[PDB]
Amino acid sequence: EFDAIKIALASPDMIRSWSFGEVKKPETINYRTFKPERDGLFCARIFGPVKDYECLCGKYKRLKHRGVICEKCGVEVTQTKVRRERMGHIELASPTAHIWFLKSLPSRIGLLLDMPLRDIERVLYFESYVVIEGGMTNLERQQILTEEQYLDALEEFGDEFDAKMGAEAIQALLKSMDLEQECEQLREELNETNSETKRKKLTKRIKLLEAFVQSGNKPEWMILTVLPVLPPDLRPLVPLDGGRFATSDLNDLYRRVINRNNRLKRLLDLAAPDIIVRNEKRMLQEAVDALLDNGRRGRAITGSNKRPLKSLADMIKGKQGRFRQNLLGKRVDYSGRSVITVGPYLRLHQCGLPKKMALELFKPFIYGKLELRGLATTIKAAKKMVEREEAVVWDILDEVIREHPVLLNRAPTLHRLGIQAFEPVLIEGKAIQLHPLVCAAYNADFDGDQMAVHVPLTLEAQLEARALMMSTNNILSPANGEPIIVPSQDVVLGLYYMTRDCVNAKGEGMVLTGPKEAERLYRSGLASLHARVKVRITEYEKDANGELVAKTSLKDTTVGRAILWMIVPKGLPYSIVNQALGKKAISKMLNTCYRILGLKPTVIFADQIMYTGFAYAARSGASVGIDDMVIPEKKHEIISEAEAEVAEIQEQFQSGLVTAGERYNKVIDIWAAANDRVSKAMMDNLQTETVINRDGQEEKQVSFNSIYMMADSGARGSAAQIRQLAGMRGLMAKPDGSIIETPITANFREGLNVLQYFISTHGARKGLADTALKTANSGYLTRRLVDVAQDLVVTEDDCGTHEGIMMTPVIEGGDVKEPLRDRVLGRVTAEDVLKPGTADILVPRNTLLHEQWCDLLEENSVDAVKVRSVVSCDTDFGVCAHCYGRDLARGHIINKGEAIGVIAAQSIGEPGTQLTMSSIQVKNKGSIKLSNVKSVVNSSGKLVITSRNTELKLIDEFGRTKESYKVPYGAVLAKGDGEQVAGGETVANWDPHTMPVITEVSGFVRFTDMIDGQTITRQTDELTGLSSLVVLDSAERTAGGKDLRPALKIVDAQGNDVLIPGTDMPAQYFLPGKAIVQLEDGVQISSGDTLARIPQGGLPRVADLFEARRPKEPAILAEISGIVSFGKETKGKRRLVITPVDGSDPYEEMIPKWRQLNVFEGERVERGDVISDGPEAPHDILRLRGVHAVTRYIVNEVQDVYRLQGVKINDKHIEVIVRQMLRKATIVNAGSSDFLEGEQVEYSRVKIANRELEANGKVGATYSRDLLGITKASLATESFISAASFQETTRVLTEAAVAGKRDELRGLKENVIVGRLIPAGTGYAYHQDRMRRRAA
Amino acid sequence: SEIGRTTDPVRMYMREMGTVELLTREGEIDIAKRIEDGINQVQCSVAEYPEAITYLLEQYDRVEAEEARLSDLITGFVDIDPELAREKFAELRAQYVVTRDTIKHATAQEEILKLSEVFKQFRLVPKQFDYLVNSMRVMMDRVRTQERLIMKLCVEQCKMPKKNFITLFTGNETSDTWFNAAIAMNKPWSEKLHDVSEEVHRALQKLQQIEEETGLTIEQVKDINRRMSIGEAKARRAKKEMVEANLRLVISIAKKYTNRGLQFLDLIQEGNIGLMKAVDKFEYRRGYKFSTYATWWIRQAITRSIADQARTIRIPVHMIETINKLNRISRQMLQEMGREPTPEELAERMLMPEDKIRKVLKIAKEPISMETPIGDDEDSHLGDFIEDTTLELPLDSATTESLRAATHDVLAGLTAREAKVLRMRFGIDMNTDYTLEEVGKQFDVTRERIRQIEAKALRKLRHPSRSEVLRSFLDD
RNA sequence: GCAGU
Ligand SMILES: [Mg+2]
Ligand SMILES: [Zn+2]
Ligand SMILES: [Zn+2]
Structure with a gap:
């Protein structure tokens, strides 16, 4: 039908070609008879007939004569629907500037004319003249003039030159200009300009001019001489039933425009003075500019409610514009909604649908089945039968819903499991019955939640509901590969109570012939569910060939685990139920069953688990009383001891020994110690209070307390709440965050008094307000991520690349936070993984690392696997199915057509509402190993690191690292490199509060330009015994030694200048200001000791990481690898220079010296080493260290936020967003290509252009990748429909219009806007057919 | 200055408006007399064109027959009473007598400005003078289109700065005797003008025809046209000073209508239109101050604008x-x-x-x-x-398509002739329905027979044999 | 605006 959407500027000829007549009069309709008035805003002659096939005089009334232009009134005889399609126009008496191309910055009229917007707004508001042609005169072409200056120019030059004002002048300037000549002239004066700011202005102006000359646009079309009129059925004037009318604001704005325009034509005919016609032209300009964009220039026009009128631009932009409110989401037929209730009798694929909802949702299905089966002779008869609700329409309704799925949806749909399909079971209620196991997927509790039901009509929609979205296909999560159809509070508590053991329980010690006899004993009341017993268990294991081999053994079990074994499918072991099953043990049971046996046994197992958990929780009688919350009898004495302790700290404050700051801190710590004591005493009382008798001897076991059974199951609650029920609830914070020094010494079993309760409300309402105000932030982050990543589809099977990230375990300091297993599970390897014993490949090159392969990776001790990632995929316009890896929801390699960007964006932004708003001591045994090493030995026997970024890992006896610390520069290391340690001992120590400069090699003092009094101030003090010296500040020096930097260097007592071993450049120590030296001239210090000392999260953090924003004071990274030196000083910025000897040396930086610099002038640096310290900026990481480096940085810094809240998200989903962020490139060398230096091109475009150039021998362009934020990358797509739909519709539409852009509907949003199949999923085959048959 | 500091057009209006000083009682008198001098001298300038004199005198004899009333003929006479106009238009007739034949061309050049300054005492109305000035604008368009014919009939043929050809034209006005020295330059322009020297023919005389039907030479009536333009721009210049001075009166009036449906600037612009109407409808000889007149006109304009738009x-x-x-x-x-x-x-x-x-x-x-x-x-x-x-309910769309199917079957259960008679008489399967005469011309059968055929098929379909499904398409 | 999730 159509394959692209071209946007451009509208010529006045184009505006007159759309229109079906000119609107000459502001008349909307006639007031007596509501027929629309001639030549008006609603004109039946212009805009078409107001009734179907009927002219407005009624002379022609039937479609016998259609398409007939009546002669009594000029109304065509055709459908009235043409009033939604037929535009009109207004001939403006004065040219009027378009407000979008004048005011949306940067001004296109301003950028095109090389004219400031203040000058243009003064010319077109009739406040100044402008010389549209100079001639043989000193007046140039952009020279504005005042009124009297224009009079003086007319005195001196007469009627030779041409000068005008208003938008006629701007239109003459846009019309008279030559575009190709000025473009080539700007290219000339850009080749000869080296000022980077002028080069930026020139290149943006050149791209504007060349975008005009490549498209069909002319500049003067930005000045409206004809104005279009929207069809009157889109700005309707409709009579409300109460006699009153209801109009759109567009009729008021159009009527204002036509009134001012007809008055301007009047004044131009009357030959009015220039003051009046200038004021009228200004009013017409502001009325047209209020029609197009109200409020963009100055004060918004407000009509008759003192509320601003909604202009044309407001119809299409914003959260209430067409793009977001009617085109990306829309109200939908065949849709109902009701409250959800449990229905625990259901199977995983069933919902309960009310009969009175399903009779309305499926009305045409019932009409057609009543017509078909002969039960109704007509559709009117069938309608009456459904309306009366006969007994036969219920049989028909049972027929029409039989295998017909419905989609159930709980808004907010945070992720794709917020819409799942179900087969309806007709129930008689009015509430939907939602299966329990899917509630966690919807985040749905039955406390009033409502859910919408949608009916898939077509066979394709029914088959997607059944194949793609049905809740039996959805038992794994797409964020992490873990089960999401998972048992929960009542189920977990039932299975925990059944699978526990009691010591002397009824029926202990007998021997059973199997699980069926155990169930017989329990139901007969001959044995309790916890009696430790001996059951003959037959279990099957999948053999290596793939079938199930049996084994029969007497298992020491309890009666309840024997009973639960009856529902476990065959290929699972007995160790899977022979334990007290908490929430995680049940989730592991389900995950094991899914990996071992598959989906079809797992859904049966999940339903059976739910039924048996509900059943044996019902039989449990598990109840919360008030005696379940046992307060420890040590609470009162622990609290009295803490009160006595704070009283002694209070008398120590009254006696002045401690300041109120340390007093406050010590009172807080001796209240938190008491809180931890009370919590430990409470839990020690609560977990094991069951002491019971085995053959007379008392014996303690795990408590059967209900509060503890719920907490220990993981059914509901944690010890953080049990501590507030039965312990104390401790220190509460003020509204600002400073914790109050006296705690709530009460719990909820006892009362909180009035003051304790008020103090607790302080933090309660803060939590509630953050919850109510961060959903509007996490939803906005999710929206930005979706609109950056939507178009990423898996489009290939393999790109054949060999790149990939080196996955390693996440070791934050001393402990691991994510192993290699959950980091490489599901990836494909990028290179052959080989054993630590080399030359035998452990895992082959291109292998998908499923759970067996990961078990192989942890049998051996491989700790770094190079895997393939989407940031390194060679596929252009998409991602190969190998560089993604596994589809986490299914568990196999991902299919071609999966829309992985929307999955990644939902998986990241779904947990958003769970977010908020010195010496090293090796912990366990291992062999230390330091990297980035430059090392010497000290005078005493330490190991001294003369290197900045040396990092100390603990290589264990297997090769894998278990802790990773950062040892600073100059820190003395007690051990060597490769020496075993003891668990808990210290390896490295240093000075935390000051930075030492350490001796390179043993030698003698030379004070080179260390001038006393000019660069050195001598200080004296008694308790040191030896006088000290300070090298002077910048603001304390006299003229002198700041220009010649004072240096301390190495010599011998020989008089020979002993220097670094290996080089002969002069060794120095250039001591900066704010330093300390307590050493005199000629002192002897050996290598390895100091010579001088120098003193020194949440949801917004994720949002800032993805917007790629530069931090406040970023770390200054070394650009290129060279040696450090210094230039000019004291202009506020010391001048660093980094010189590589092996090339073009000078690279100079302008570091402001109020930053504490982190490198000395002697050592060599590399790209990325921090010259100064601070939070790294990701642009610098991408620029200097590479793409994989900023990828690793962003995924680590995002998972750091997500792992504090205990949120598992696979790294694929952050790597997708990172790939979509670094999607542009800048040309540094244009090469033999059609790009310009310094322009931002799509990276895939320049990559394939370089490929097709290198194919023909010509060398391609070279580029530098860019890191844009998710907003700046969403708005910079090559598709203007997606960008205009996202946000900033006005800027995107003006850029796209003046660029003459084209949008090929390639992503997902442009195909949702126009109502097509999306190019992902079941619409991917359709688009492959469409682009392989519309290409040849 | 304050240029470029504001975006409100109200402030820009008040800024550009306050830079005009108000008028005293005697200043309005001076401005109105400047206006009156401009308009009566331009009316004397069209009185230099004696076809206007012929029109005045023929409508004067029609006044003697009373074709229209005298008030919208004449407003009075300066040094309504109708007996001044009759006999002193007869006086102007005697003046036209003494100028019609007293040319025997150096002695005729005094009686024409005597005509002007004896026409001095005349007042004229707006509308018949508008007829006269539209005739004068026809004269203007003819003069300028003939002189521009002279301009760009030769320069579309030649390349030469045409001042050499204008130097010979002014004064000839009768013939191409000024073309005898055109070729004397012998630079190719007048060579190319050879091929134009004929096709100016019926142009160059025809204006010179009406030249003496209105009596005066084309160059001196061009002088009359430029003197008219000077006098009329003199009048319009002083109509500008009176409007721009009383622009504060419009604002002081329009501030009383502010929230009555229009913006402030719309009110003051309609009041400005009313003030221009007051200025060109104001006469100072009544001795009343101008503000009391402009207030009536501004109130009228602003209230009419609120009533209309x-x-x-x-x-x-x-x-x-x-x-x-x-x-x-x-x-x-x-x-x-x-x-x-x-x-x-x-x-x-x-x-x-x-x-x-x-x-x-x-x-x-x-x-x-x-x-x-x-x-x-x-x-x-x-x-x-x-x-x-x-919109139509999709149940009603399904009802319509089902009724189409049912009707199609229960008319397929008939003879093709009568079934087509029913499909042809109603609009079934056809864009129009046909009356009995139409199909009578079509079926080669007289009207009442096929009427009986339609009644036959209707009586046939009324049976409960076929009409059991159709009856369910009737309401309950 | 006021509530519900
Ligand atoms: Mg709820
Ligand atoms: Zn008509
Ligand atoms: Zn790839």
Whole structure:
């Protein structure tokens, strides 16, 4: 039908070609008879007939004569629907500037004319003249003039030159200009300009001019001489039933425009003075500019409610514009909604649908089945039968819903499991019955939640509901590969109570012939569910060939685990139920069953688990009383001891020994110690209070307390709440965050008094307000991520690349936070993984690392696997199915057509509402190993690191690292490199509060330009015994030694200048200001000791990481690898220079010296080493260290936020967003290509252009990748429909219009806007057919 | 200065407007006398064109027959009484007598400015003078189109700066005797003008025809045209000073109409139109101050503008006056009896029928905006509760297609002749229905026979054999 | 606007 959407500027000829007549009069309709008035805003002659096939005089009334232009009134005889399609126009008496191309910055009229917007707004508001042609005169072409200056120019030059004002002048300037000549002239004066700011202005102006000359646009079309009129059925004037009318604001704005325009034509005919016609032209300009964009220039026009009128631009932009409110989401037929209730009798694929909802949702299905089966002779008869609700329409309704799925949806749909399909079971209620196991997927509790039901009509929609979205296909999560159809509070508590053991329980010690006899004993009341017993268990294991081999053994079990074994499918072991099953043990049971046996046994197992958990929780009688919350009898004495302790700290404050700051801190710590004591005493009382008798001897076991059974199951609650029920609830914070020094010494079993309760409300309402105000932030982050990543589809099977990230375990300091297993599970390897014993490949090159392969990776001790990632995929316009890896929801390699960007964006932004708003001591045994090493030995026997970024890992006896610390520069290391340690001992120590400069090699003092009094101030003090010296500040020096930097260097007592071993450049120590030296001239210090000392999260953090924003004071990274030196000083910025000897040396930086610099002038640096310290900026990481480096940085810094809240998200989903962020490139060398230096091109475009150039021998362009934020990358797509739909519709539409852009509907949003199949999923085959048959 | 500091067009208007100083009582007199001198000298300039004299005198004899009234012929005479006009137009007739033949061309050049300064004492009305000046603009268009024919009939043929050809043209006015020295340059322009030297023929004489039907030479009537332009621009210059000085009066009046439906600037622009009307309709000989006249005209213009273009569904000015009288009367009644008056007492304080008051009260409402939020709820509006009533229910679309199918089958159960008679007589399967005569010409059968055929098929289909499915298409 | 999730 159509394959692209071209946007451009509208010529006045184009505006007159759309229109079906000119609107000459502001008349909307006639007031007596509501027929629309001639030549008006609603004109039946212009805009078409107001009734179907009927002219407005009624002379022609039937479609016998259609398409007939009546002669009594000029109304065509055709459908009235043409009033939604037929535009009109207004001939403006004065040219009027378009407000979008004048005011949306940067001004296109301003950028095109090389004219400031203040000058243009003064010319077109009739406040100044402008010389549209100079001639043989000193007046140039952009020279504005005042009124009297224009009079003086007319005195001196007469009627030779041409000068005008208003938008006629701007239109003459846009019309008279030559575009190709000025473009080539700007290219000339850009080749000869080296000022980077002028080069930026020139290149943006050149791209504007060349975008005009490549498209069909002319500049003067930005000045409206004809104005279009929207069809009157889109700005309707409709009579409300109460006699009153209801109009759109567009009729008021159009009527204002036509009134001012007809008055301007009047004044131009009357030959009015220039003051009046200038004021009228200004009013017409502001009325047209209020029609197009109200409020963009100055004060918004407000009509008759003192509320601003909604202009044309407001119809299409914003959260209430067409793009977001009617085109990306829309109200939908065949849709109902009701409250959800449990229905625990259901199977995983069933919902309960009310009969009175399903009779309305499926009305045409019932009409057609009543017509078909002969039960109704007509559709009117069938309608009456459904309306009366006969007994036969219920049989028909049972027929029409039989295998017909419905989609159930709980808004907010945070992720794709917020819409799942179900087969309806007709129930008689009015509430939907939602299966329990899917509630966690919807985040749905039955406390009033409502859910919408949608009916898939077509066979394709029914088959997607059944194949793609049905809740039996959805038992794994797409964020992490873990089960999401998972048992929960009542189920977990039932299975925990059944699978526990009691010591002397009824029926202990007998021997059973199997699980069926155990169930017989329990139901007969001959044995309790916890009696430790001996059951003959037959279990099957999948053999290596793939079938199930049996084994029969007497298992020491309890009666309840024997009973639960009856529902476990065959290929699972007995160790899977022979334990007290908490929430995680049940989730592991389900995950094991899914990996071992598959989906079809797992859904049966999940339903059976739910039924048996509900059943044996019902039989449990598990109840919360008030005696379940046992307060420890040590609470009162622990609290009295803490009160006595704070009283002694209070008398120590009254006696002045401690300041109120340390007093406050010590009172807080001796209240938190008491809180931890009370919590430990409470839990020690609560977990094991069951002491019971085995053959007379008392014996303690795990408590059967209900509060503890719920907490220990993981059914509901944690010890953080049990501590507030039965312990104390401790220190509460003020509204600002400073914790109050006296705690709530009460719990909820006892009362909180009035003051304790008020103090607790302080933090309660803060939590509630953050919850109510961060959903509007996490939803906005999710929206930005979706609109950056939507178009990423898996489009290939393999790109054949060999790149990939080196996955390693996440070791934050001393402990691991994510192993290699959950980091490489599901990836494909990028290179052959080989054993630590080399030359035998452990895992082959291109292998998908499923759970067996990961078990192989942890049998051996491989700790770094190079895997393939989407940031390194060679596929252009998409991602190969190998560089993604596994589809986490299914568990196999991902299919071609999966829309992985929307999955990644939902998986990241779904947990958003769970977010908020010195010496090293090796912990366990291992062999230390330091990297980035430059090392010497000290005078005493330490190991001294003369290197900045040396990092100390603990290589264990297997090769894998278990802790990773950062040892600073100059820190003395007690051990060597490769020496075993003891668990808990210290390896490295240093000075935390000051930075030492350490001796390179043993030698003698030379004070080179260390001038006393000019660069050195001598200080004296008694308790040191030896006088000290300070090298002077910048603001304390006299003229002198700041220009010649004072240096301390190495010599011998020989008089020979002993220097670094290996080089002969002069060794120095250039001591900066704010330093300390307590050493005199000629002192002897050996290598390895100091010579001088120098003193020194949440949801917004994720949002800032993805917007790629530069931090406040970023770390200054070394650009290129060279040696450090210094230039000019004291202009506020010391001048660093980094010189590589092996090339073009000078690279100079302008570091402001109020930053504490982190490198000395002697050592060599590399790209990325921090010259100064601070939070790294990701642009610098991408620029200097590479793409994989900023990828690793962003995924680590995002998972750091997500792992504090205990949120598992696979790294694929952050790597997708990172790939979509670094999607542009800048040309540094244009090469033999059609790009310009310094322009931002799509990276895939320049990559394939370089490929097709290198194919023909010509060398391609070279580029530098860019890191844009998710907003700046969403708005910079090559598709203007997606960008205009996202946000900033006005800027995107003006850029796209003046660029003459084209949008090929390639992503997902442009195909949702126009109502097509999306190019992902079941619409991917359709688009492959469409682009392989519309290409040849 | 303040140029470029504001965006409000009201402030720019007041800025550009305050830079004109007001007038004293005697300043308006001076400006009005400048206007009057410009207009009566331009009326003397069209009096230099004696076809206007012929028109004046023939409508003067029609005044002797009273074709139209004298007030819109003449406003009086300066140094209505009709006996001045008759005999002193006879005096102008005797003046036309003494100028018609006293040319025997150096002695005729005094009687023409004597005509002008004896025409001095004449006053003329706007509309018949508008007829005269449209005739004069026809004269102007003819003069300029003939001189531009002379301009670009030769220069589309030649390349030469045409001042050499204008130097010989001015004064000849009768023939091509000025073309005898055109070729003497012998630079190729007058060579190419060879090929034009003929086709100017019926041009160059025909203007010279009417030249002496109006009596005066083409060059000196071009002088009359430029003197007319000078005098008229002199009048229009002084009409500009009087408008630009009284622009504060328009604002002082229009500030009283501010929130009555129009913007402030719309009111002051319509009042400016009214002020220009007052200026070109003002005469100072009545001795009244100009502001008292311009106030009437500005009030008229502003209230007429509010009556015409302040409403979405425009109501006429008579219904606007009716609604204003109604609101005033109900205002006074509420003030005297402390409650809103019923239409059956509002109709008796006025003297209109009660149903007229009811329809007037039904009329006076302004349309709601569809962006009005409901209950201060911003995400909703009035616009998304309004349904499209003109649509057809898809159950009714299915009913229509099912009725088409059922009718098609139960007419397929007939003879093709009579079934086509029914499909042809109604509009079934056809764009139009046909009356019996049409199909009588078509079926080669007389009218009442095929009428009986239609009745035959209708009686046939009324049976409960076939009409059991069709009856369910009838309502209950 | 006011509530519900
Ligand atoms: Mg809820
Ligand atoms: Zn008609
Ligand atoms: Zn790839």
